[PDB]
Symmetry: D2
Subunit: 295 residues, 4 copies
């Protein structure tokens, strides 16, 4: 990629956000630098509209995956960099469980020597007493894996992952992310095989800063890419897939009386084997059953 | 059934067989009595043509399942008795693994007070040094479950099971039995739900008999019958069924290099999860894989 | 053994019993014959004192394990025959679960050509509405493995096994059998390695008998014998043994609140691994725990 | 703790090392700052003796666990801070697998407003062609958990963990760390319950620095602390412990012929059950066996 030659050495980063969550508007400006070579990000965010409506941790993901470190044997699956300097568009939808959602659209591109992230975000359906709008999130972060996948039809990628937020009672607010990327530029881009980005982050405060702010450090590394063994697991995939997605079956098992579970399994077991034609397929399909007799 | 009333008390039994195994002909006459009340059978067999060309054990199953004890709660799934006194026809095929086969047709019915089994048997493809024609079966028997299933279209029953014959070196000769029963009469019969007959047997000699003979003692008891739980396992059945019968998949897995198996599993495991979308279906489909990495 | 030569061919059998069950006395005489060559037993029992106070099935085991077929490779671990013609003494205790017990002593030996079993039986602690004294046993039998073990110190054998009696409601009455055999004679006997007798049995009536009777048919075959591999499993034995018998632990686990079980396991799991020193021993000891979180 | 009040707000850090590895001497000086409040470390190392004998990654651990972030419910198990300002002594031994070892002794204490780490390190027995002295380690790092444990007898703590180093061929150099801490000061210190430190690190280069150097960013958080459920798992611990440490047994199983493994298991299985006294203990002890029939 021609983009790859932009990401050697420390690059300056600048970030602009306009947010709107349950009619709370707000703006964030961020600056810093990223070192792709060692998969390193450092960024400072100032709330430019006063205090922040939402907790800081909720925005970490919204606020540069072109600064991930790609190992040499992988560097031909780096879509992010390959899209530069013209850049890409990053659209996400973020479902917090039992609560509202964000919908974002960013343009990431180069404006001279600087890499800028320009974001519009729009939250709705939050619960005034919830984890978000109640500010019950802990000022911290965890590590996640960012499964990428090509979208050869739309010349971009499809991304998905699930962020865990800590809360003070020990519980964990889930944040189901559905992401999609697409080149603003007309030039060709790398369209990757399935792999992931292993992310780690910590959140801190500057002690000579009195406005509402977050100091964000990100670590990012690409991974998950090491025959005909390929062709085999593609099938094992679909067989377990059609299985877990077979709406007939899922409905059928949910619909069962399992307060007195022990009898229910045994009779269904013995009913399966009334024709007495045992094969490993049934041993397993009944072990998916005895499996499902847990949750 | 009206047939049931004929099988209270001890019934005299008469058995006639005409055989041909690799162009070896032979005949067998058997007499004894049967007690369906306590599922009991005693029979003596004389070879009327000199010595027997096959081992006695191979002939036990060929040589009255209307003498099975049906527990009270089952007596309506008793097909065999219900077809009497007019009778039924019992056709089998018997694949000795790695070896020849028997193809039988027998008419079982009443002739006055006696219950007669009249048999023609035809064996082809045995090995002149095999387990049968070489006579390497031990003079004994083991216990087996005889799975029955209605055949509503043919007004009879399908039957299948698998006899294990002991051999001297400790190994075991399989005898895959494929059976079917059909009423000679036009009267109505009973068409059973899936159940099974639990058979136990012992083979002996009479010490005042000098002709080639077998003394056969059989015990036979029906079993395997105790909702919407029915409808559920019908599906679990087919899902494990299509699975084990999916010729694509079976071919695919057989076609794999498993002398160095440990790597093969792990990479296929990690290839399945390169898109990192885990669901129990795949956990199980890969546990059918790691399963199959045994035989 | 010289005893073995007495058990070729059909031997006449005679059986005498004197009983006392909850102050109910009774007597039983049985005659038949035994064929050790094909492990075969046929016996008829008359109640000489009118009706029987107990169900017939309870008495089957009390009512000739010297008629078991020992395969050629085993015939040196045949204790029963080797003690003949002088004989042996067979003492049992029989705990019906949730119920009374039989304490028997029998002398089995030859008196000329006949093999006699002479029995005194004494039952206490039954329930006047129980499974026995209430007569709720079904007139049938199941198949059992009779584990034998040498008792080199007492020049005899220890024996133990567990009979399952069928009852009408579908439940099953256990009969925990604790046996021991000891030669009346001074001659040398055979002291067996661990093996077992595979028994199968059927109970019936004679239709020209008007007195209270049982017709008993037994099949009995020795089995369970095929290095330094011996020495290994002796240890695996004790390790699982001390484990299951460790009264500290058994008490400890029984003493746990498992109405809300899911949390209990996880915390104990995480408490085991707070020092974070994982080894397979703990993976297994916790898999004995998660195991025990079932019954 | 009185030490806790020293670690609010950004503290300056200064590090001195004198190393000697296979007669290669060297010196490292490091400076930077740590923010305990958010479990954050930033440090720069300059090689003051020229080029470095050993790879940079090998020293990360040697080069401030008093800057870990302790959650409020844990802050009474913070030994590190409690030992301040007088400080503690940190002794480690580091076994790299299939290669040499480091032995270190540091004094960590306050010298005015600064937290200084003073280190003597001494490596021996490395292989001139190895992963270390050959420089085959990758300039990166992974995440680890740092299991702490009190040593109430020696008024300090015992620490242990296992660092994985990446190598270019995809393989992983292990670094078994055995650590121990002890107050230079005579004042009392907190002696913790079992918990761990979750560490994450990345390694980078300053682009305006021409001497041999590492930029080290560490993230550190305490965790692993959430009844009578305590007392239970203490036992499950020892039972799986004595088990995995029982040298009799471990020797015994290693000593077995497992090129033809299938027979070996089955016979040992059948030998365990020749007395036919099944209990869950043996089911598990044999499932530790069938377990061990893998590696």
């Amino acid at each position: 990629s021609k983009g790859e030659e932009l990401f050697t050495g420390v690059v300056p980063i600048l970030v602009e956000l306009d947010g709107d969550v349950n009619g709370h508007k707000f703006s964030v400006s961020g600056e810093g630098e990223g070192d792709a070579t060692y998969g390193k990000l450092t960024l400072k965010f100032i709330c430019t509209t006063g205090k922040l409506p939402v907790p800081w941790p909720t925005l970490v993901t919204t606020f540069v995956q072109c600064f991930s470190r790609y190992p040499d044997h992988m560097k031909q699956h780096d879509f992010f960099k390959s899209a530069m300097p013209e850049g890409y568009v990053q659209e996400r939808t973020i479902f917090f469980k039992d609560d509202g959602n964000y919908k974002t659209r960013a343009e990431v591109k180069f404006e001279g020597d600087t890499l800028v992230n320009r974001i519009e975000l729009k939250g709705i359906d939050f619960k005034e007493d919830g984890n978000i709008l109640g500010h019950k999130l802990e000022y911290n972060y965890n590590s996640h894996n960012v499964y990428i996948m090509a979208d050869k039809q739309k010349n971009g990628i499809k991304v998905n992952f699930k962020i865990r937020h800590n809360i003070e009672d020990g519980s964990v607010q889930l944040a189901d992310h559905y992401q999609q990327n697409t080149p603003i530029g007309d030039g060709p881009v790398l369209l990757p095989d399935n792999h992931y980005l292993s992310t780690q982050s910590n959140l801190s405060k500057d002690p000579n800063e009195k406005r509402d702010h977050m100091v964000l450090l990100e670590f990012v590394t690409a991974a998950g890419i090491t025959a005909s063994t390929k062709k085999l697991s593609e099938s094992l995939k679909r067989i377990g897939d059609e299985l877990d997605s077979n709406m007939e079956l899922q409905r059928m098992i949910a619909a069962v009386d399992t307060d007195s579970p022990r009898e229910v399994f045994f009779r269904v077991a013995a009913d399966m084997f009334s024709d007495g034609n045992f094969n490993w397929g049934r041993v397993v399909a009944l072990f998916y059953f005895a499996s499902k007799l847990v949750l």
